[PDB]
Symmetry: D4
Subunit: 159 residues, 8 copies
Amino acid sequence: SAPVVGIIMGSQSDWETMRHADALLTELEIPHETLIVSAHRTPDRLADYARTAAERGLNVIIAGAGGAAHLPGMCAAWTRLPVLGVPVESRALKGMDSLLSIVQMPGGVPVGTLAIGASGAKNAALLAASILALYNPALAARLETWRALQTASVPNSPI
Amino acid sequence: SAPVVGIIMGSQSDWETMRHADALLTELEIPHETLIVSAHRTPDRLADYARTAAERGLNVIIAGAGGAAHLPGMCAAWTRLPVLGVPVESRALKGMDSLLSIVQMPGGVPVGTLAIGASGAKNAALLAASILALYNPALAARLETWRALQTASVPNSPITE
Amino acid sequence: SAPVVGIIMGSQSDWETMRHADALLTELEIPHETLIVSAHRTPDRLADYARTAAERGLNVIIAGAGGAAHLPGMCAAWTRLPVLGVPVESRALKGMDSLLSIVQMPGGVPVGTLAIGASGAKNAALLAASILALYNPALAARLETWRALQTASVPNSPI
Amino acid sequence: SAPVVGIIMGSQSDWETMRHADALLTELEIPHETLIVSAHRTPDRLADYARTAAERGLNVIIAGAGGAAHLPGMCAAWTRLPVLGVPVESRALKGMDSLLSIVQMPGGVPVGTLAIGASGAKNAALLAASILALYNPALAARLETWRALQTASVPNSPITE
Amino acid sequence: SAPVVGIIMGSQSDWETMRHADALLTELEIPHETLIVSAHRTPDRLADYARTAAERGLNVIIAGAGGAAHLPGMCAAWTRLPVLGVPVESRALKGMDSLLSIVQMPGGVPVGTLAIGASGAKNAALLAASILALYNPALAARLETWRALQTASVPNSPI
Amino acid sequence: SAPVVGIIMGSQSDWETMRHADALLTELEIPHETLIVSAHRTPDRLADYARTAAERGLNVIIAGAGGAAHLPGMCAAWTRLPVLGVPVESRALKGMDSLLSIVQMPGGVPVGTLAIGASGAKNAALLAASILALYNPALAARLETWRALQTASVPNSPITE
Amino acid sequence: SAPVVGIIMGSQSDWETMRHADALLTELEIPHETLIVSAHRTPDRLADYARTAAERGLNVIIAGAGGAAHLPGMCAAWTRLPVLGVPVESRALKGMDSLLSIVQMPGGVPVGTLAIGASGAKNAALLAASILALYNPALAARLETWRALQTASVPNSPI
Amino acid sequence: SAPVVGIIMGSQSDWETMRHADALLTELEIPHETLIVSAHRTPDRLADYARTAAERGLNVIIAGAGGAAHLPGMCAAWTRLPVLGVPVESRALKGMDSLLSIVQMPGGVPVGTLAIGASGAKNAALLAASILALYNPALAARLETWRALQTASVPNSPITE
């Protein structure tokens, strides 16, 4: 029941994208919390969140942000937990700024980065699931089923 | 002694970059194997490697490749294990082709991507470590100590010559 | 009657683009098959498809995909047949990711890459036709007629 | 002895890159000619070359150029033969201008484009070979052997020094 | 009455953009011809057009094309006349391909390149006008008036 | 003697670039401090530095970082003072990642960004100077003289060898 | 009452973006002027504006422009005052041209550059406010309140 | 002896690139002047230069600059004469900032832009020559001869070593 995955985003505007991560986790029945934490507007909230993540039982953190996206990186700076970053598509630069701002982390503080947009949010949840599956037999079976269904469901020819 | 992390790369040329992941896993005392698997030259070897990774005891796979870098993505297509990708810097496009070829995975098959080059290789090992640390108290302690030292080792001012 | 060209795409979403390749081949009366084969979701389906392409009589394979587009490259990895790649336009990066993921193949395994989008799908079919025309006199004549009509039909001034 | 593949480039400076296509065709025993044809400096030479390629017995044309690379595209405009383009790496933009100038052909006139630089030149020859192999059993056998060797020649692990 | 400026574009699709060049020339009463000449689809038409431009009385050629834009460059290859290139905005890459394909001409064969899109078409006409103005006193006065009106008409504050 | 401008950078490697800001502030006689503050390795040090900057008497902060450059932005998140950011040139992407990571701040938390590299570092110091000059007549006079000299020092023609 | 901040833009088309800077300054009760000054169409107007800015009492200049954006740079060339540049989003290149044209100023003449678009216009106003706050106690308090409200208003979870 | 073409650049560092335009104009016997005019450091010098260019007898202006290259555009804002711009290659962004800063002029004030670097400088001179040739039969003849020689000087095949 207690969340093992924390999904955080810089603002309501990121929800359209991050909701895909939320749906995936719920789908696979992975207890998680979905919150808004702004690196730029609520820096202390971020520090406290990341710093106490481990103590609270969280195992993985999924963070999404766009533009000069610092949320994932700074979160990773305050936690020993794996941090997965989702580059939210920005209006002007289409998430290229979001991508470089998140993926180009200097050695020492990692952020496992996913694709720009919805695909990245969904994949961050799947990656978080594959991580949790390493020590959760039941979830591992559900993930196997999920991947198996994805594969089996692909049509043989276009409509 | 059994490897829990697999480091794979498309060729010997990728070693200059991937050696950084290898060194860090060793530093943190994480058993691992290092192999060359070419997505384009040995596609069947890749299929078999990724398909059997879980049963062989591997928990995480770190894959590096440059240019049209398909090694990480295709590995992830065959394994349920988390796959971390390292974009190897390419000559002409400086790893931008490597980066986009790895990070832009469509929804459904993830690849946790790290920075272009050496920094990415090191961080891939560190991310793999933080993943394994979730269920290995001893490692969690070594990682905590490693991160704590990194923080304490940062100088307060630059050597202004 | 048996297909000599195989058009494959990663998903239904690629059809809007790849249909242009299908139309062109049909137009020139080139027997072909149009299928969905996902490099990421159906890797074994891809391996089997590419590996047996030659045996089945296929002469050229046209593969389309977007984002981290691996379909053309991996297909080329399992076949000695010419593989033509079509970069499908992606939402965020407009097919720049698709393009680099397909064209930047390391030496040893080629993929003849065409333009991003519809133009690329149409040109992949035309390129496949020019290849088949080298050993098919009748088709060669039809291709000549096609190119001749394209040239002759260009208006002299805009409307 | 009659050439079945034509390798053309805009200038001597392109040879450092295009020599890789030449060497591979020779390796696979594919008769070919290597010439310099400048789309901008010798437009009429280009027109004549492309226009008569088919009647001269050529089956495939490999064209290389950098910067505002128009050689492949314009060649394709004059021949019904398949034209493969090699983006030669440029100084400032690292072949990105070369790449876009070649691959982005509007629908109606194709150019099978390969990677920027040496890898693209080699692959252009290999693609040309796979095209010719469709109707040349002997060549098909040599190509199969070449690809098989490439696969078997890949090391299983890197030389970790 | 005889055209002194030739506006050429690869296809009808370029008209939306090139019409701005046509309007400007007409505005300044510069005799010109507006035609469709495809470098890829009508290469011989292009060769003949460019090769005979000077003989026909043309002084400047304005050429527009998108994607792998070769029209301006090839036109410049067959004429000693100044060739101005207009990068037409392409669907996927927004004219970045058009721009690089036109501006990056190797030394020896120039193409004076303008901005991507409508602005470039309009500026190509203005640049052509400034060239013609060097030997046409009347036109020079009209261009001066045009530039003077542009400057004087700029508002002092936004609405 | 009390510093009114703070120059901070993520590591010693940034000094080669940031030294230009330091030298210019000294040239204009602007008291300042130069420190290393890592946004990723010493996040708490950054929080404290930025939070207390105003009370410590600082008026402007010049922050430099490369790659995923978060130092300027995060500093601005904790201080009401104007923060100027210098994109340090990165190896692979030539500072483009540094630039976008700094300049693209969402509305609400600004960072006055300067050019990639040395020019940006120098201009950050000059911008800081023009800010301080608004309420320091003496400095305003030195800046005016500096700008006037720059203008008068420009040669009228190049040395054509 | 006399303006201490000058907001200038190249044309009416920039207003959609620059209005955000105007709103912010008004919000914080910072006396300012909002004008249209074109670097390319009204160069002398720009020279005079920038050259006399200081004398007129202006403390900071916020300049916005798109495409080959020269307004901020040239303004900075004629004034000792701090110049903040706002890259207006351009149609084709989405403000990447605007950004590079403004931020890449050579050493000697600075331009504090903000994000492309609305965010940049808003941040330029905030940056100008943080500068003025250094010598205006009352404004400093209002800015503190503004930043405090921004931080406190961020929701804890998405809707 | 009176100059009909003016070559201007922002600094001595631009000369390495702009010298190519100078040499070509001399080769074609086109009288010209070469000066340094900084758009940012000597804005008033630029205003005066561009404003009086026409009355001084200049017919074409070739302007080169790198980075945030505003010299060509601002020159065009003050003169009715055609202005040709040469993007000087920049260190970090390889002239891409130079290119966009010059070519992307909004409708109303043109700048005929050439390629990044030396090739652009040479072509700017050649374009200027083709402009002047429209009303100078002697020059038109020299240009025709120059272009004809360029075409005839292209080798038929590469020196394959």
